[PDB]
Design goal:
heterotrimer; A mainly beta; B mainly beta; C mainly beta; A: Immunoglobulin-like; 2 domains; 6-stranded mixed β-sheet; 5-stranded antiparallel β-sheet; 18 strands; elongated; C: mainly beta; 8-stranded antiparallel β-barrel; 6-stranded antiparallel β-sheet; 1 helix; 16 strands; 57% strand; immune system; lipoprotein; neisseria meningitidis
């Protein structure tokens, strides 16, 4: 029942602004120091900020420089990070945590992305079997040129998970992301079972269900 | 002014083995302010050990922190599958509470050769002026794999990108995709597109190919 | 010094240090505890107030004790020495048994145990927000009040740790391992962790934080020795 629940975040352009919030549950919030730590995509942890019990004493890492400010609300039992003048280097997952230094409780983390690129839904193309392994066939679908991560792929409205691999996304030179999702199925079912890939890119509100048929 | 260096960067072991992770501080430090955190795939960090040797409240007995001065060790005995994750040390004596760069603990298993499939660009994609060719290496181990594109026996370079999944939860294998990108024009000037795969599990390279437009 | 005074003088709220200590786990509901010293004597029941005000701070004070029941007249279950350690905002009791009865009229056993820890419990939500404090006091056991207790608490980290030194038997000069500060059932601030001897775990320790500005800690440690469990009394204060 001790809990830290986060909110806010999103995608902003350089020099823009955001707010993170962190709601506490199950422990005396006012007694504690509280902190924010960030993880850049693919890297390690970096302390950002902390604030004392009373809410007026505030420490910041050397990269902050008054662009991010920390505050707390001891009656709503919440903490905030106010983010201004954001730089692409501030892109990361930000965690709130209890205590100064010894982070013994962590929120679930929220994604802050800072980029000049614009929001764009993907194109979805089929990856169709061309010549028959023996009894196992591979198929998939290619999700190309989308910006805001992430994209969620499922298969047959979520009914197909056996044999699915959805590859992690890669940033192309275009500054747009791309990925493929594949599934291996019994070759005996290519003629009888329809396979469809569902692509949901929430930041652009794009949804693409797409048929994957063997050709001959 | 203080850097924490963890070694080794990555590591493979079987369940039931014992892991030995190093945390080295650039200066001597006070052990009551040394912490270890565990970060599993896609989750928040978790406090595992503080004061170099005290277990956090739900860390099981098989984790033990130790050391002094400049070295601290996390010894994970009798590895259970939930223990394969990333581990970070940290000196929280004062700001900026430096973390180490981490150590990734992955599962060691027997060699498995990949299944290789090649996928031609879709007709629908060709309409838009771009040709992506995709090569799939499925359910293999270890992770090291060489993927080589050949277009009419010309070896490609600088025009492809690989992506590898995380270890599979059931069989502890990896999969990999390699994507070759060409202009529609460039694509229609060549016939044989081949994906050559070399890997510990294969006795010699495997090649998958197709002939354009068929 | 004022041992006999403590047995006779009523409670005076202008004496030094902790001025009274309620005897809860020193006397149960059934018994009476008789304490004597310097020719004076006084019998305490459960929850009665003992006047620690009349005593020196930072010392151990020694009374002879008898733990009676009136089933006819007295029946003394236990005898020996009753020790109080007084600080400004906290204090401990302790029993050094010397004689226990039998079904045979009195056997001869020696056992040492902690009785009551009490004082102005620092409320968890009014700890100092930040900073680090160093506490120093005594660690005392059976036939030894020469132990030295060092302890450090980082309040924003919510962590304490320290060490017991200079006791007569080596098996108790122990590290008090890093432990967090947690709220009590009455929202008092308490630490409870492991005892460590040359890097190995060897029991437990407990500490309450006392005083309005967390000036003192007080509690006990159970340490495993080549001859079993031994109880230590712990009291330290700030600079």
């Amino acid at each position: 029942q001790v809990q830290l629940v986060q909110s806010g975040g999103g995608l902003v352009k350089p020099g823009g602004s955001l707010r993170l919030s962190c709601a506490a549950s199950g422990f005396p919030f006012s007694s504690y120091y509280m902190s924010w730590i960030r993880q850049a995509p693919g890297k390690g942890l970096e302390w950002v900020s902390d604030i004392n019990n009373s809410g007026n004493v505030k420490e910041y890492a050397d990269f902050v420089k008054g662009r991010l400010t920390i505050s707390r609300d001891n009656v709503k039992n919440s903490m905030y990070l106010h983010m201004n003048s954001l730089r692409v280097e501030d892109t990361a997952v930000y965690y709130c945590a209890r205590n100064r230094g010894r982070f013994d409780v962590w929120g679930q983390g929220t994604l802050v992305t800072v980029s000049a690129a614009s929001t764009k839904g993907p194109s979805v193309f089929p990856l169709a079997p061309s010549s028959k392994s023996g009894g196992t066939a591979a198929l998939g679908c290619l999700v190309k040129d989308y910006f805001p991560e992430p994209v969620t792929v499922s298969w047959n409205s979520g009914a197909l998970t056996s044999g699915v691999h959805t590859f992690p996304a890669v940033l192309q030179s275009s500054g747009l992301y791309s990925l493929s999702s594949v599934v291996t199925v019994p070759s005996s079912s290519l003629g009888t079972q329809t396979y469809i890939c569902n692509v949901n890119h929430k930041p652009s509100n794009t949804k693409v269900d797409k048929r994957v048929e063997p050709k001959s | 002014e203080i850097v924490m260096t963890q070694s080794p960067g990555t590591l493979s072991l079987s369940p039931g083995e014992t892991a030995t992770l190093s945390c080295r501080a650039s200066q001597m430090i006070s052990s009551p302010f040394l912490a270890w955190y565990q970060q599993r795939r896609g989750q928040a960090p978790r406090l595992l050990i503080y004061g170099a040797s005290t277990r956090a409240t739900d860390t099981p007995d098989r984790f033990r922190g130790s050391g002094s001065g400049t070295d601290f060790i996390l010894t994970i005995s009798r590895l259970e599958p939930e223990d394969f994750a990333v581990y970070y040390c940290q000196y929280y004596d004062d700001s900026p509470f430096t973390f180490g760069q981490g150590t990734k603990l992955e599962i060691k298993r027997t060699v498995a050769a990949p299944s290789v499939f090649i996928f031609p660009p879709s007709d629908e994609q060709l309409k838009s002026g771009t040709a992506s060719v995709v090569c799939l290496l499925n359910n293999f181990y270890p992770r090291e794999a060489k993927v080589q594109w050949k277009v009419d026996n010309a070896l490609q370079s600088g025009n492809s990108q690989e992506s590898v999944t995380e270890q599979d939860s059931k069989d502890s294998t990896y999969s990999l995709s390699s994507t070759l990108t060409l202009s529609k024009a460039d694509y229609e000037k060549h016939k044989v597109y081949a994906c050559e795969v070399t890997h510990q599990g294969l006795s010699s390279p495997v090649t998958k190919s197709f002939n354009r437009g068929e | 010094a004022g041992l006999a005074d403590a047995l006779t003088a009523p409670l005076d709220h202008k004496d030094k240090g902790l001025q009274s200590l309620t005897l809860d786990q020193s006397v149960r509901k059934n018994e009476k505890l008789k304490l004597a010293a310097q020719g004076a004597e006084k019998t305490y029941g459960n929850g009665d107030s003992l006047n620690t005000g009349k005593l020196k701070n930072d010392k151990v004070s020694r009374f002879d004790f008898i733990r009676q029941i009136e089933v006819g007249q007295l029946i003394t279950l236990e005898s020996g020495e009753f020790q109080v350690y007084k600080q400004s905002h906290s204090a401990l009791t302790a029993f050094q048994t010397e004689q226990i009865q039998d079904s045979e009229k009195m056997v001869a056993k020696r056992q040492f145990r902690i009785g009551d820890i009490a004082g102005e419990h620092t409320s968890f939500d009014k700890l100092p927000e930040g900073g680090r404090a160093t506490y120093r006091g005594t660690a005392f056991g059976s036939d030894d009040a020469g132990g030295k207790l060092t302890y450090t608490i980082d309040f924003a980290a919510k962590q304490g740790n320290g060490k017991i030194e200079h006791l007569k038997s080596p098996e108790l000069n122990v590290d008090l391992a890093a432990a967090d500060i947690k709220p009590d059932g009455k929202r008092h601030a308490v630490i409870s962790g492991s005892v460590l001897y040359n890097q190995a775990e060897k029991g437990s320790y407990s500490l309450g934080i006392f005083g309005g500005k967390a000036q003192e800690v007080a509690g006990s440690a159970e340490v495993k020795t080549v001859n079993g469990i031994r109880h230590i009394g712990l009291a330290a204060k700030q600079e």
